[PDB]
RNA sequence: AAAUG
RNA sequence: UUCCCGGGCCUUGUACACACCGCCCGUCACGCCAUGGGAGCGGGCUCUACCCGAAGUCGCCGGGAGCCUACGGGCAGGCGCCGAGGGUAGGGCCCGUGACUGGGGCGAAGUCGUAACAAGGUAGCUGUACCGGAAGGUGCGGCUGGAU
RNA sequence: GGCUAAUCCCCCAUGUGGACCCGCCCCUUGGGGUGUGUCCAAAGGGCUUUGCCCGCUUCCGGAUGGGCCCGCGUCCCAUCAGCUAGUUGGUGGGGUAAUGGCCCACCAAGGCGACGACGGGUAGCCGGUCUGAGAGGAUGGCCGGCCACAGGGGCACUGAGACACGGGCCCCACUCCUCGGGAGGCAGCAGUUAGGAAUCUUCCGCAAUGGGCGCAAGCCUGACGGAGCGACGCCGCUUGGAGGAAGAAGCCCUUCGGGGUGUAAACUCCUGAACCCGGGACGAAACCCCCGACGAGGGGACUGACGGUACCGGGGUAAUAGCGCCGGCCAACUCCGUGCCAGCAGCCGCGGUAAUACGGAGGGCGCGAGCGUUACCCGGAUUCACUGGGCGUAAAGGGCGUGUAGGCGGCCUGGGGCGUCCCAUGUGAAAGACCACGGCUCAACCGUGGGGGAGCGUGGGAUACGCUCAGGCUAGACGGUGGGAGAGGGUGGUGGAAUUCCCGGAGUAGCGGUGAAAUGCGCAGAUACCGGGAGGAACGCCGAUGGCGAAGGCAGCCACCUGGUCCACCCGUGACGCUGAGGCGCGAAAGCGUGGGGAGCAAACCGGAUUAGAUACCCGGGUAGUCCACGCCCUAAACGAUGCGCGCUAGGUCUCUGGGUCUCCUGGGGGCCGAAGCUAACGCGUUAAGCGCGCCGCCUGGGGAGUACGGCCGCAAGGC
């Protein structure tokens, strides 16, 4: 879920 | 032969469609009671007990309408429709309030009751229900 | 079938297969765009239609359509989606709800602007 | 005998 | 009037109707999607045997020994069965995930041939078997949903 | 460590009664009543005070709230088919209020399951709610009934009652407070936080209703009664009403004449939502006090959170409109921009320069404090079909038998009354629903009556049909006697024709083969011909549109064993039947195992031609196999693409096999054309695909795919 860097994980 | 009653009804239905004067069915007192209603309500002229090769039958005298004009002279029927309701596969019983109206009164519904074989009209009067044998019009 | 067979086996109730699987019961569902690109549709159409690969709150990732003319959607844009597919673009089984989260309304839109999330103009 | 649009 | 090109009428087959310059099949290359398999890896539930075992009721004891008395008794206290759970070991089902792998679907103005639909140019279809880049071919038997 | 009260605790007494053992009467599960032995009660406090009031004690009945047990009902998966040691039952006992394997010791070996045990998935269930012509489907939030849980688990204590949300213990996880550990349990009412697409005020009051305790004033009450936020839903109301040009401007269209918005506006008069001012509740008469008696009855008083609210009066301002759609379904049409771009999209489909389908605009349609979208339920869907569908070719008859269970079953007489049917009676709470009345200005919302039904208990009644027991019957069925046709099946034997090889003889220049050829064979003597041998496989004519078999399928001839079947006579049995999930057997070809056998033929395979190629079609070779025995496999265009039995509905013609009187009539098979009828049509039609009943199997859009997983089977291939 981790994205290149966003305090949004999903 | 699994159902004697359906047989009859159909012997009849089969007979009228070629406009046979009569047709015989194997004899039974219960078939008679049903036959009784068929004539008294005017679906037939009537019936008489007979014998074929020592075998009791009920000969049934068929009834039809006036010859017709047009490219097809074939007359209308007295019995347009006769078909089983209650069957050996599915037994069908009604209580008095559930007894149906055939073709809005125009036709009858025969049913076996503890007060005998009666019509729909006849049952509701006598106030009883039973095995809904068939419907005719 | 005979009445008896019906007593034995019975009639079999049909079931309904939802056409909106990722939604997991809900009316709408929140998410973020991982990919934002254009996809050409299947015959007999030609276009560059607007889509987003979107990551669901249910830890799902669906391909979703971007309605309107033009958009403010990019990678990392938080977005809201709704059901209904786009026939010409296979795999896109959901629509982006414009005018919610980082999904802008359509600039200059005057007709049916509730569907395209545009506030009433001057 | 003898292919394809 | 056999042949080639065009045409008229009758009939017959058709999966053609953008009407044979029609239709259409499988591999192979590319892209996307979902699924199976996979040395395994991670979780959930669950079952069996055994070890330890709290509180607590029940049962035994209450004596080298305390307290109470209403002492042929009671209470504390000591033992025991069961017991939440913990632990060791081995099973059963479900889910997720996995280098790689299998075919599948879609995409398309790609590559190869042209198997099928007209007797489709070797009638087709079939179960099976063997072979072949691919459609497919061939054997054996069956079907007509074929021959005109 | 010690003092002391009571409705606290204990003993003695008393005994209406009750408890217990035993005997006996009534009863009939442990229900009553006796007799004897023995065992059990208690608590006092108040005022005004030779009396009433609240308390206590044993027993008996009522009433209300329960516990336990039973019948029937209650989701998906059989790709879950077997499950069970306290398991099932007996004995004795423990335990409770009480029955019970609830618990214990022992004894016996039982209990459950295709009517679906066991296992897995999912769910609190009902009144009801939603949809639907109904049948049915879906659902169980709010209100009412029951159950379950109170962080996760176990436990018991006190008690009428709990194994107890804001009681107790103990283990765990987690957090908290500052070394011994003490501490917590909002799934109460608000509130925070996290999750989410999303879900309310840390509000007011005990005034009412209602609960606990109290002789009673009253205390407590986040139950509750109100208020707060949110168009979340339904319901009611507004942004005006009458007048106002052949018709402002502006914009949109235009045939350049005009047409449109549109009486719409502007403008006139009339009204007067909001707002101001005043008055202002119903909900509240009880408990209490008073006379009588602290009863009956009559009279006093008290108190309202919402609230200065509703409502009623005086005034009083023209005072918010937005949303969807306008290709067809589907109500609403025209300019411009764009040019398979931008975009629309529920489906069919729009966009490639003149788009009613994209974006704006004018205009139009539709609803309106809403309009739309998304999600889900029922509907339309007679598309799981009970109501109310189907299976020759559209999806669908099982490859064929045989048969277990089950489902169904001729004629007649009677017994029972089980299904079935009628009547009474009980139940079917309340709310909801339905009709009528009525209350808030209607309504939404709310009262009061009326109508009930299914379903189950009970009592009576009926007996045609189904059932059951009982008695008979001969039409179904099955036997007896005599007779028939047939490639039906198994074993063995055996006859000719042909192909091939081998020996012999005779003979010579080619034979073979194709579209034409070539490969191949041939002076090492082929082909063509004659004689003789060997061996395998298939049986020409008869032969048919024929015959037989359940299907697969069966063909020279003989004999032996053996099945099905038709006829006649009308002798025997007396419904002994039809169908048939599972089960069992049979099942072409190809294929597999072990031995045989191997002439012809022939996958693979080699070669010769054709062809761009030719892993084919054609030609010359050729191995498995084709054959036999035994054992497997279990497929199919295993087709009539038509399950089986029965009854019923013109005939015409051909044929096979019987019996008769022999023109012909009658049976049983096989075809054709056709009555009625069926059919989407083609076609079917006494060999139904017609009209009907019984039972079974099967279908539910195409692809994925008869694929995967599981399971069973198999040597494998592979099958279900
Ligand atoms: Mg297009
Ligand atoms: Mg709109
Ligand atoms: Mg090509
Ligand atoms: Mg071509
Ligand atoms: Mg020509
Ligand atoms: Mg001519
Ligand atoms: Mg022609
Ligand atoms: Mg045609
Ligand atoms: Mg994969
Ligand atoms: Mg996988
Ligand atoms: Mg151990
Ligand atoms: Mg232990
Ligand atoms: Mg002692
Ligand atoms: Mg244990
Ligand atoms: Mg354990
Ligand atoms: Mg532990
Ligand atoms: Mg997995
Ligand atoms: Mg795995
Ligand atoms: Mg071809
Ligand atoms: Mg071919
Ligand atoms: Mg060819
Ligand atoms: Mg061909
Ligand atoms: Mg063909
Ligand atoms: Mg083949
Ligand atoms: Mg190659
Ligand atoms: Mg080949
Ligand atoms: Mg063949
Ligand atoms: Mg054809
Ligand atoms: Mg004292
Ligand atoms: Mg005493
Ligand atoms: Mg035991
Ligand atoms: Mg006992
Ligand atoms: Mg007992
Ligand atoms: Mg037990
Ligand atoms: Mg034992
Ligand atoms: Mg649940
Ligand atoms: Mg319906
Ligand atoms: Mg339905
Ligand atoms: Mg409820
Ligand atoms: Mg709900
Ligand atoms: Mg509820
Ligand atoms: Mg607990
Ligand atoms: Mg909690
Ligand atoms: Mg706890
Ligand atoms: Mg618990
Ligand atoms: Mg409880
Ligand atoms: Mg409690
Ligand atoms: Mg507790
Ligand atoms: Mg609490
Ligand atoms: Mg707290
Ligand atoms: Mg709370
Ligand atoms: Mg809150
Ligand atoms: Mg959030
Ligand atoms: Mg509230
Ligand atoms: Mg109160
Ligand atoms: Mg009260
Ligand atoms: Mg409060
Ligand atoms: Mg409102
Ligand atoms: Mg006006
Ligand atoms: Mg004018
Ligand atoms: Mg005008
Ligand atoms: Mg104007
Ligand atoms: Mg004008
Ligand atoms: Mg009042
Ligand atoms: Mg007085
Ligand atoms: Mg005022
Ligand atoms: Mg006023
Ligand atoms: Mg105005
Ligand atoms: Mg609309
Ligand atoms: Mg409409
Ligand atoms: Mg229209
Ligand atoms: Mg195009
Ligand atoms: Mg453009
Ligand atoms: Mg639009
Ligand atoms: Mg179309
Ligand atoms: Mg055009
Ligand atoms: Mg245009
Ligand atoms: Mg438009
Ligand atoms: Mg449109
Ligand atoms: Mg309204
Ligand atoms: Mg639907
Ligand atoms: Mg039906
Ligand atoms: Mg159908
Ligand atoms: Mg069949
Ligand atoms: Mg079939
Ligand atoms: Mg039977
Ligand atoms: Mg029976
Ligand atoms: Mg009968
Ligand atoms: Mg009865
Ligand atoms: Mg009611
Ligand atoms: Mg009224
Ligand atoms: Mg009422
Ligand atoms: Mg009898
Ligand atoms: Mg005989
Ligand atoms: Mg040879
Ligand atoms: Mg020689
Ligand atoms: Mg020589
Ligand atoms: Mg014989
Ligand atoms: Mg006789
Ligand atoms: Mg007799
Ligand atoms: Mg049978
Ligand atoms: Mg076989
Ligand atoms: Mg074979
Ligand atoms: Mg094989
Ligand atoms: Mg092999
Ligand atoms: Mg072999
Ligand atoms: Mg061999
Ligand atoms: Mg070759
Ligand atoms: Mg070749
Ligand atoms: Mg050859
Ligand atoms: Mg050869
Ligand atoms: Mg050979
Ligand atoms: Mg055939
Ligand atoms: Mg078919
Ligand atoms: Mg069968
Ligand atoms: Mg036959
Ligand atoms: Mg015949
Ligand atoms: Mg005949
Ligand atoms: Mg015919
Ligand atoms: Mg006709
Ligand atoms: Mg005929
Ligand atoms: Mg005939
Ligand atoms: Mg049909
Ligand atoms: Mg369907
Ligand atoms: Mg599908
Ligand atoms: Mg499908
Ligand atoms: Mg297969
Ligand atoms: Mg398979
Ligand atoms: Mg498998
Ligand atoms: Mg093998
Ligand atoms: Mg089979
Ligand atoms: Mg099959």
Give Cα separations from B103 to B109, B118, C50 (angstroms): 10, 17, 63
Kindly tell me the burial class for residue B86, based on how many C-beta atoms sit within 10 Å of its own C-beta (0-12, 13-18, 19 or more): buried
Residues B10 and B75 placed together within one structural domain of the fold: yes
Which of left, alpha, beta for B77 (phi over 0: left; psi -120 to 50: alpha)? beta
Q: Decide: helix, strand or coil at residue C69.
A: coil
User: Å from A6 to nearest chain C CA?
Assistant: 7
Tell how strand C78-82 and strand C92-96 pair up.
antiparallel
Q: Does C32 touch chain A (CB under 8 A)?
A: yes
Considering its fold, how many domains does chain C have in total?
1
For residue C57, give the nucleotide whose C1' atom is nearest its CA. F196
User: In Å, how far is C35's CA from the nearest CA of chain A?
Assistant: 11
* Domain identity same for B41 and B104: no
Alpha-carbon distance C110 to C112, whole Å? Answer: 7
Tell me if B116 sits within 8 A of B76, measured CB to CB.
no
CATH number of the domain residue C66 falls in: 2.40.50.140
Same domain, B7 and B70: yes
Contact between residue B68 and residue B75 where contact means Cβ atoms under 8 Å apart: yes
Q: Which of B79, B109, B125 is the last residue of a domain?
A: B79
Q: Residues 39-98, chain B: which have Cβ under 7 A from strand F? A: 54-56, 83-84, 86-91, 93-97
- CB of B22 within 8 A of CB of B14? no
Q: Domain range holding B85?
A: 80-137
Method underlying the structure? X-ray
Residue C52 contacts residue C36 (beta carbons within 8 Å) = yes
Angle between helices B4-16 and B29-40 (to 10 degrees): 40
Task: State whether B60 and B7 are in the same domain.
Answer: yes
Are B12 and B75 part of one and the same domain?
Answer: yes
Same domain, B69 and B114: no
Whether residues B72 and B121 share a domain: the answer is no
Judgement on whether residues B12 and B74 belong to the same structural domain of the protein: yes
**Cβ contacts of C67 within 8 Å, gap of 6 or more:** C50, C95, C96, C98, C115, C116
Number of domains in chain B: 2
């Amino acid at each position: 879920t981790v994205x290149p860097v966003x305090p949004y994980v999903x | 032969l699994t159902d004697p009653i359906a047989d009859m009804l159909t012997r009849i239905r089969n007979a009228t469609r070629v406009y046979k004067e009569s047709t015989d069915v194997p004899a039974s007192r219960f078939k008679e009671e049903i036959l009784r209603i068929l004539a008294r309500e005017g679906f037939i002229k009537g019936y008489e007990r007979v014998d074929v090769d020592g075998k009791p039958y009920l000969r049934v005298y068929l009834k039809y309408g006036p010859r017709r004009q047009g490219p097809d002279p074939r007359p209308e029927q007295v019995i347009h429709h006769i078909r089983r309701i209650s069957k050996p596969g599915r037994r069908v019983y009604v209580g008095v309030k559930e007894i149906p109206r055939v073709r809005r009164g125009l036709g009858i519904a025969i049913l076996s009751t503890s007060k005998g074989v009666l019509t729909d009209r006849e049952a509701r009067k006598l106030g009883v229900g039973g095995e809904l044998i068939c419907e005719v019009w | 079938p005979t009445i008896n067979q019906l007593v034995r086996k019975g009639r079999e109730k049909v079931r309904k297969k939802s056409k909106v699987p990722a939604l997991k019961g809900a009316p709408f569902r929140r998410g973020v765009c991982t990919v934002v690109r254009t996809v050409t549709p299947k015959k007999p159409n030609s276009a560059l239609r607007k889509v987003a690969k979107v990551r669901l709150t249910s830890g799902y990732e669906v391909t979703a359509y971007i309605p309107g003319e033009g958009h403010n959607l990019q990678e990392h844009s938080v977005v809201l989606i709704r059901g209904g597919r786009v026939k010409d673009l296979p795999g896109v089984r959901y629509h982006i709800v414009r005018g919610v989260y980082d999904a802008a309304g359509v600039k200059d839109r005057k007709k049916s602007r509730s569907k395209y999330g545009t506030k009433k103009p001057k």
